Ligand binder design. Structure first.
Ligand code: HEM
Ligand SMILES: Oc1ccc(Nc2cc(-c3ccc(O)cc3)n[nH]2)cc1
Length: 393
């Protein structure tokens, strides 16, 4: 028999019980990736946190030529260090202030968009597709408002993502075509005088500010492309698979409908058990570092399995159960940890909270319209998503 291969399953509605047996017997284990490279798979909360909290496990260095690779680069190699380049241009504070849910009228725009999408579904009649006709259009509309771009440009940018976020063994020619086209669009936004709000509106005025005169134009447009794609694919995928977990639990669904003030705690447990990230977080060791029973050598690839940490019984007792009263509710790794902690976590939380709350009010009796096995799980992709999520209510 051959070396164990990752990823285990494209399914995002159950964790394979091989994860628990691996975490107990071998919390750091040698695996093979889709490119044929070997990597260290880390599946325990203690070791995942160690790897994420140690910058000698470098994300930037995963882009080096000849390194062992989890998948093929779908971006220019310098875009792998996206947040490092943003921080070096002095734009980190401005970017993060622009993508908070605390902007005036942002939460109200979400609820109106969520209610409008659910009303169209109700009017068309069951069955409805909650991913393509709810969760994804909501994520797309939210990021258009956050970036400051017209809502009508959302759909054409969204359809690049099924290729842009592939997990491929080989480079993808269409990924570069979509990237170049989406960069040109974002560069025109920076030259568009009608774009004065959101992230692109702020970046536009900073581009003309003397303190940013020697920041490259490619970087301003890269921020727009990279934050739209990362945000749309992460919020849309998380909300899609969180709705499945809710629907599968009619008692939890009724409780959140009856007492909607528990929705923030519900979303935190849905984040912890979430399987949206299809691969471990890749890091390349830049030194010899002891991890558990393994001396990781310089130049080797490390994969941080988030569901291994988030389903760890040593840190979350009874990990498969949704418990709205845990003592450590936000200590999960759904947003990462350390240097590269997700910069849009607050906006991702409010997107799911508002989407769920609107769904429970409009379709309180929402349930699957097909047996759970009939869902089609997207393969070789950086997220686990069903192609369609058909429901009745
Ligand atoms: C439910 C929603 C989301 C989830 C579960 C999520 C998850 C994550 C995780 C786990 C990481 C860490 C990656 C690593 O350490 O290798 C990350 C990073 C990142 N996220 Fe999110 N994310 C979400 C929403 C968003 C949103 C709304 C945005 C922007 C609008 C965004 C933009 C980014 C960016 C740019 C990074 C790279 C950070 C860096 O390299 O320092 N994400 N995300
Ligand atoms: O129209 C589009 C939209 C997305 C992409 N693909 C793509 C990769 C990333 C990314 C984000 C963050 C990061 O740290 C590293 C890569 N964003 N978008 C291409 C064309």
């Amino acid at each position: 028999t051959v070396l164990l291969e990752v990823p285990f399953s494209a399914r995002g509605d159950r964790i394979p019980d091989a994860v628990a047996e691996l975490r107990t017997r071998e919390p750091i284990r040698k695996v093979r990736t889709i490119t044929g490279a070997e990597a260290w798979l880390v599946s325990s909360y203690a070791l995942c946190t160690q790897v994420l909290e140690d910058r000698r496990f470098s994300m930037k260095e995963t882009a080096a030529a000849g390194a062992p690779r989890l998948n093929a680069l779908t971006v220019p190699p310098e875009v792998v260090n996206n947040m490092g380049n943003i921080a070096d241009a002095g734009l980190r504070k401005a970017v993060m202030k622009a993508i908070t849910p605390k902007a005036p009228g942002l939460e109200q725009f979400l609820r109106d968009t969520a209610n409008s999408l659910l009303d169209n579904l109700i009017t068309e009649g069951a069955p409805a597709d909650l991913r393509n006709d709810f969760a994804d259009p909501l994520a797309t509309a939210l990021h258009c408002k956050v970036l400051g771009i017209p809502q009508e440009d959302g759909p054409k940018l969204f359809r690049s993502l099924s290729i842009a976020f592939m997990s491929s063994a080989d480079p993808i020619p269409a990924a570069k075509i979509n990237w170049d086209r989406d960069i040109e669009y974002m560069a025109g936004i920076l030259e568009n005088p009608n774009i004065t709000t959101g992230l692109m509106g702020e970046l536009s005025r900073l581009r003309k500010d003397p303190a940013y005169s020697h920041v490259s134009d490619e970087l301003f447009a890269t921020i727009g492309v990279t934050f739209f794609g990362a945000g749309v694919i992460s919020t849309g995928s998380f909300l899609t698979t969180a709705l499945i977990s809710l629907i599968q639990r009619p008692q939890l669904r009724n409780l959140l409908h009856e007492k909607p003030e528990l929705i923030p705690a519900g979303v935190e447990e849905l984040l912890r058990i979430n399987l949206s990230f299809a691969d471990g977080l890749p890091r390349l060791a830049t030194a010899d570092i002891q991890v558990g029973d393994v001396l990781v050598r310089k130049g080797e690839l490390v994969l941080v399995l988030l569901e291994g940490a988030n389903f760890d019984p040593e840190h979350f007792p009874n990990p498969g159960s949704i418990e709205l009263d845990r003592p450590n509710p936000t200590s999960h790794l759904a947003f990462g940890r350390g240097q590269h902690f997700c910069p849009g976590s607050a906006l991702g939380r409010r997107h799911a909270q508002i989407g769920i709350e609107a769904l429970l009010k409009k379709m309180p009796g929402v349930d699957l319209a097909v047996p759970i096995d009939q869902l089609v799980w997207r393969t070789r992709f950086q997220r686990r998503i069903p192609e369609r999520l058909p429901v009745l209510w």
